[PDB]
Enzyme design. Sequence first.
Site, PDB file in Angstrom:
ATOM      1  N   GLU A  13       0.813  -1.206   0.000  1.00 21.52           N
ATOM      2  CA  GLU A  13       0.000   0.000   0.000  1.00 21.52           C
ATOM      3  C   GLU A  13       0.849   1.260   0.000  1.00 21.52           C
ATOM      4  O   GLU A  13       0.567   2.207  -0.740  1.00 21.52           O
ATOM      5  CB  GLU A  13      -0.907  -0.051   1.222  1.00 21.52           C
ATOM      6  CG  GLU A  13      -1.880   1.070   1.389  1.00 21.52           C
ATOM      7  CD  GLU A  13      -2.751   0.835   2.608  1.00 21.52           C
ATOM      8  OE1 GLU A  13      -2.534  -0.187   3.295  1.00 21.52           O
ATOM      9  OE2 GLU A  13      -3.649   1.652   2.884  1.00 21.52           O
ATOM     10  N   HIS A  14       1.910   1.273   0.791  1.00 22.60           N
ATOM     11  CA  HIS A  14       2.767   2.442   0.864  1.00 22.60           C
ATOM     12  C   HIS A  14       3.514   2.649  -0.438  1.00 22.60           C
ATOM     13  O   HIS A  14       3.862   3.780  -0.793  1.00 22.60           O
ATOM     14  CB  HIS A  14       3.761   2.251   1.992  1.00 22.60           C
ATOM     15  CG  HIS A  14       3.129   1.840   3.278  1.00 22.60           C
ATOM     16  ND1 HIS A  14       2.730   0.545   3.522  1.00 22.60           N
ATOM     17  CD2 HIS A  14       2.843   2.541   4.399  1.00 22.60           C
ATOM     18  CE1 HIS A  14       2.213   0.469   4.733  1.00 22.60           C
ATOM     19  NE2 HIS A  14       2.272   1.665   5.289  1.00 22.60           N
ATOM     20  N   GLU A  23       7.078   1.691  12.671  1.00 22.79           N
ATOM     21  CA  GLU A  23       5.695   1.906  13.058  1.00 22.79           C
ATOM     22  C   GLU A  23       5.138   0.729  13.835  1.00 22.79           C
ATOM     23  O   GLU A  23       4.387   0.928  14.793  1.00 22.79           O
ATOM     24  CB  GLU A  23       4.855   2.174  11.821  1.00 22.79           C
ATOM     25  CG  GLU A  23       5.189   3.490  11.181  1.00 22.79           C
ATOM     26  CD  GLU A  23       4.504   3.672   9.854  1.00 22.79           C
ATOM     27  OE1 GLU A  23       3.939   2.684   9.341  1.00 22.79           O
ATOM     28  OE2 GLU A  23       4.530   4.798   9.321  1.00 22.79           O
TER      29      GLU A  23
END
Lengths: 39, 436, 62
Positions: free
Chosen positions: B60-61, B137
Amino acid sequence: RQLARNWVPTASLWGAVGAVGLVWATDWRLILDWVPYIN
Amino acid sequence: TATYAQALQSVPETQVSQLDNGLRVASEQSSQPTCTVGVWIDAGSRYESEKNNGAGYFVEHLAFKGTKNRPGNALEKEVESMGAHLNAYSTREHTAYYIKALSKDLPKAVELLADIVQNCSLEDSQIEKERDVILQELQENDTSMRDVVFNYLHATAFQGTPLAQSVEGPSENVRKLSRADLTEYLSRHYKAPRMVLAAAGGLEHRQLLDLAQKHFSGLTLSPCRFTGSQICHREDGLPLAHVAIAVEGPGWAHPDNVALQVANAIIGHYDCTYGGGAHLSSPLASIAATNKLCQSFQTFNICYADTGLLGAHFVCDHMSIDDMMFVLQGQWMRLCTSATESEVLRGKNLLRNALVSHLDGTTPVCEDIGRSLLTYGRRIPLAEWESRIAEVDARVVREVCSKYFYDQCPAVAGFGPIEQLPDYNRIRSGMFWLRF
Amino acid sequence: VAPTLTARLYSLLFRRTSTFALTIVVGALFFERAFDQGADAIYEHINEGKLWKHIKHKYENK
């Protein structure tokens, strides 16, 4: 209001319960034999 | 004019078009200078394998790190050239790539967008960079307790199903992750008909489809088990302890899904910060403000394809936990029997409002379609929803809740300082009333 | 496919606790009427002619 919801049928059973209960207890009225009750 | 009955009537209708390779096309004309341009994909973690776990998330990133025709960071430098905001996000059951833009330069947009959907630069320069950030993260993710407990929540109900698993997936995979396996999942599920396209704005339907304009789109699931169980992470240091409790429910497509929309709206929610005080109609918002038995809570619904989730999420003092509960079982249980048509109405109105409310704005309008398509198809049964509202009845809600509440096996998630929280065997006996 | 009586039964009776309670007395009644009636035979089957019930027939009303 007064809307008495399923409490109505609910309660309906309840009285029947212990009524049978006292009937189950000993009571007075015999109970036409209806499956063997001794003579 | 604006009159609620007539208000349903005049709306730009759902549009649909279909290309050959499985791509879907659809639209609605808002008579607006701008257009939300978006894409929705049904490829889930529930598709993803045990290595693929979190990969698509990692993916996704990556799209915006540059692509095939547009290497690193040449992608956005055109995007912000127009001044059009851009965003992307993913979900267990869906992923949505979308754009918000003026209707003018759209001819680039989708063509820009179409490039991204498949042509991608897979470059371990970005990989390691992104591999790190996620890992960075992954650990940071302990900071927001909300999301945290839900992860526990699923895994406790859906154990033994790909649906039960971390969206970002476990950590070590992300290190182990290699962009070939991506290319698999890149190749796997990014085909059409899996792909779906929609948009809303000043765009007309055919002037969409014509400039849907020749690029390309493309060339497994199981019912999940439901677990009567409990999970607890006991950590007593923290000041507060979240709680979540729920039972499973019907999937997306199902009649009753709407019938239970209101019961939540009726039972409502409370928070520290309202100006409602103790005179609110919601028994919870009345008591939970009165004796502040909790800080706040809100009820959720999430209906999966085949599944649905009904329950609440509350936060209360470490000595106040029990009493929140003994209350909360009150409301559900009393509904299933003694509820009344009056309070139905106040629930009924709200959901009409909330329904009509969310419908303003380009993107949300645009956004319904994609899932709706992936869910009910084209269906945006706008005025029907109203008719659907008229369907619900006192017996209905009772008869519905009778199914999904009375004498069931609830799921219990917890996060410390839990300890007060009673044992399961109480909660269980606490589901079915004894008539008290 | 039909539900096993179990799936019937809860839906029928055990769901509402009253009913769930109600049946309890009901069978319990018919139970004892039949139950005690059986054991005594077994009992008196075991003891034959040791009891007036068998014995007293020898001299009962002459």
